[PDB]
Design a protein around this nucleic acid. Structure first.
Ligand SMILES: NC(=O)c1ccc[n+]([C@H]2O[C@H](COP(=O)([O-])OP(=O)(O)OC[C@@H]3O[C@H](n4cnc5c(N)ncnc54)[C@@H](O)[C@H]3O)[C@H](O)[C@H]2O)c1
Ligand SMILES: [Mg+2]
Lengths: 151, 469, 51
DNA sequence: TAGATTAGAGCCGTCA
């Protein structure tokens, strides 16, 4: 698998998505996201579904007001649930809670029983939580290199 | 149809031996060069000032955004940028009641009330320093607006203490020098800019679109003052020593007694960066003259040479003096008598008073940053302010002015002089900006000079820059 | 069946609960606590009932 | 009476 998938509601959650992608790529994790490539159009869906179903080990969902009830994110969650059931992996979708307005009383049904990582108070605590979770769950990784993120 | 040349960006060095041309991006990607464990702060002011400071600290532990992330890089939060802790629990409070302030800011004589208020703050600071068991890294002074408003020289309210300046900040910094206490003065309206308004319901200063820039600036200043190294230069060639010079009026004295202060910079042979002031204010009695008498020139150059030799082990192979004024012949001969055999001495002059502007004929954006018109082998115009393509904007608003660089004394290469001068614009630790319009050898010397001129009781002052900025 | 469960109100009684959990762990027992062992992104009522 | 150098202070804009 070797790749980490990030699903977000473009173009509202771009700042945090860029920050997180750069930090993770600077730590040795291969990240697939819709903001790292400047070419679009052909196979706008095939490639994404192929990557989710074939070579994705982790699915990270940026849970916020914009991403709730967003069609593309919902389809992504459906494919992710299918793959998660196929792999018999209990911890495959890891929501990230970044919005203060989105109460936990009003989250999507597909992610309502799952333990979410909190980013509302401070982003560094959220990053520490993500790194500790990845280490505990043995997410494959490269030796951390910030030059990847710089490039 | 003359010709212009282009000079590339100097690049600066960050953690893990990685280089970048931006301090914000380099710090938000890799991190600083050394490892502070935390910043224990000491706050002095009213209760409202303490509340405002706590509010601000709680604020900057989290990401902060600008309206245009391309133009102004974001702030990902203090402890993620700097890998150290600076929060609102290591704070220590020392009250300054309004009763203390009321009885002093009424004398109607600016000098006496400035003296009294400076004393009111510094006596508490020194008492806390000498007779308490904490270990405070920096002292943060929350100054109510009225204290700063009227303590200016030429601002009116609508002998023993006359040997001091008429400025709160300068006198405050000068009278704390023999104690060596790092300090950061904050206006009350800066930390809480939302609640200070006018007769329109709007802020006096609107930081809404530039909050991340403010966070960057304050965080970098606080980090440097506690003993941090944010960044260093990239490829400073060994054996070269830079030396700024700036003259300052003395004002309240029988004679103008022009004071001259310097700033020294070189490579420490450990691939570090030694950037400290080489100062003991040298004087000239004649009025209106900005030249040193031979004895002071001899002493100054000898002191600088000795500093370099002690910090390295052998004399410089090349010394550059950057000044804002020309050098007469007696001063240069004085310099030359006390200079070793195998050391080349070059004196340069950087000026802004020269009308020359270049307009792009096509668009609405200004000239590029690295450009330069070389008038001769001993003169050139260097643009240090202009359009920077990395951030997609210009560092100024209107058509910028170039710097006029002249090789007044010695023999060197103007291309090397221009390249070096451009690379010295990247070490402004008092700011978190892409680049500065002036070399910092000429800007920190000025800041030293304008602090140790608000008093006369200072003898053998400290050299480290963190006691003046 | 060798885990000592600790039930409390979060976050009003976090200091005492964390103190007690750390003490019981130091003494050698196995402790499950709402603030130290619950996973992130897991169905939490079901896991609590299972425990 | 000029030209040519120098240093102080004060004030305003930063987005859209
Ligand atoms: N000490 C306790 O009160 C305690 C102990 C065990 C279980 N519980 C359960 O009751 C709690 C009630 O919380 P509340 O609504 O009063 O306040 P709350 O949800 O604002 O704060 C409670 C904490 O929120 C977190 N949380 C809740 N739902 C989550 C989710 N879907 N994903 C990730 N983290 C989540 C948990 O750490 C929970 O202990 C939680 O639902 C659950 O842990 C409480
Ligand atoms: Mg400062």
């Amino acid at each position: 698998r070797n790749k980490i998938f990030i699903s977000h509601a473009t173009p509202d959650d771009n700042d945090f998505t860029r920050w997180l992608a750069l930090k993770l790529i600077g730590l040795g994790y291969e990240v697939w996201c819709d903001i790292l490539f400047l070419d679009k159009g052909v196979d706008f869906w095939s490639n994404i579904e192929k990557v989710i179903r074939e070579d994705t080990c982790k699915f990270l969902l940026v849970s916020s007001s914009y991403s709730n009830q967003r069609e593309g994110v919902l389809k992504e969650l459906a494919v992710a649930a299918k793959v998660k059931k196929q792999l018999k992996d209990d911890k495959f979708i890891i929501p990230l809670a970044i919005d203060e307005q989105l109460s936990y009383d009003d989250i999507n049904i597909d992610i309502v029983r799952l333990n979410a990582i909190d980013f509302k108070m401070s982003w560094a605590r959220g990053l520490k939580d993500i790194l500790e979770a990845f280490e505990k769950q043995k997410v494959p990784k490269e030796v951390a290199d910030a030059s990847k993120s710089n490039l | 149809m003359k010709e212009l040349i282009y000079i590339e960006e100097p690049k600066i060095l960050f953690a893990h031996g990685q280089k970048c041309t931006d301090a914000r991006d380099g710090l938000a990607l890799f991190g600083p060069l050394n490892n502070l464990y935390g910043i224990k702060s000491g706050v002095i002011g009213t209760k409202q000032g303490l509340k405002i400071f706590r509010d601000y600290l709680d604020h900057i532990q989290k990401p902060i955004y600008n309206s245009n992330s391309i133009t102004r890089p974001m702030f990902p939060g203090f402890e993620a940028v700097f890998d150290c802790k600076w929060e609102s629990t290591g704070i220590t409070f020392k009250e300054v009641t309004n009763e203390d302030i009321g009885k002093f800011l009424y004398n109607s004589s600016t000098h006496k009330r400035t003296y009294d208020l400076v004393s009111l703050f510094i006596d508490k600071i020194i008492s806390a320093n000498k007779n308490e068991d904490e270990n405070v890294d920096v002292w943060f002074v929350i100054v109510p607006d009225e204290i700063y408003k009227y303590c200016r020289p030429n601002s009116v309210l609508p002998a023993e203490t006359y040997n001091y300046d008429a400025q709160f900040h300068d006198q405050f910094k000068a009278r704390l020098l023999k104690h060596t206490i790092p300090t950061q003065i904050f206006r009350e309206s800066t930390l809480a800019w939302r609640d200070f308004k006018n007769a329109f319901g709007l802020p006096i200063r609107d930081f809404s679109k530039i909050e991340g820039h403010l966070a960057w600036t304050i965080s970098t200043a606080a980090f440097y003052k506690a003993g941090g190294k944010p960044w260093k230069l990239s490829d400073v060639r060994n054996g070269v020593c830079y030396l700024g010079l700036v003259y300052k009026k003395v004002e309240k004295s029988k004679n103008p007694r022009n004071a001259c202060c310097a700033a020294q910079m070189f490579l420490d042979n450990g691939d570090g960066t030694v950037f400290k002031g080489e100062v003991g204010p040298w004087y000239n009695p004649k009025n209106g003259q900005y030249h040193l008498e031979p004895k002071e020139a001899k002493a100054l150059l000898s002191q600088s040479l000795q500093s370099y030799k002690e910090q390295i082990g052998e004399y410089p192979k090349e010394v550059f003096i950057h000044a804002k004024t020309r050098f007469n012949h007696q001063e240069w001969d004085a310099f030359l008598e006390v200079t070793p055999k195998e050391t080349n001495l070059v004196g340069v002059t950087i000026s802004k008073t020269k009308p020359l502007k270049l307009y792009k004929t096509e668009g609405d954006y200004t000239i590029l940053r690295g450009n330069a018109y070389v008038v001769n082998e001993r003169s050139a115009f260097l643009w240090t302010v202009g359009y920077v393509p990395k951030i997609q904007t210009a560092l100024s608003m209107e058509v910028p002015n170039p710097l006029f660089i002249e090789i007044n004394k010695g023999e060197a290469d103007i291309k090397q002089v221009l390249k070096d001068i451009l690379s010295l614009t990247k070490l402004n630790y008092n700011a978190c900006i892409f680049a500065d319009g002036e070399p910092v050898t000429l800007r920190f010397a000025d800041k030293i000079g304008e602090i140790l001129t608000a008093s006369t009781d200072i003898k053998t002052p400290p050299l480290a820059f963190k006691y003046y900025i």
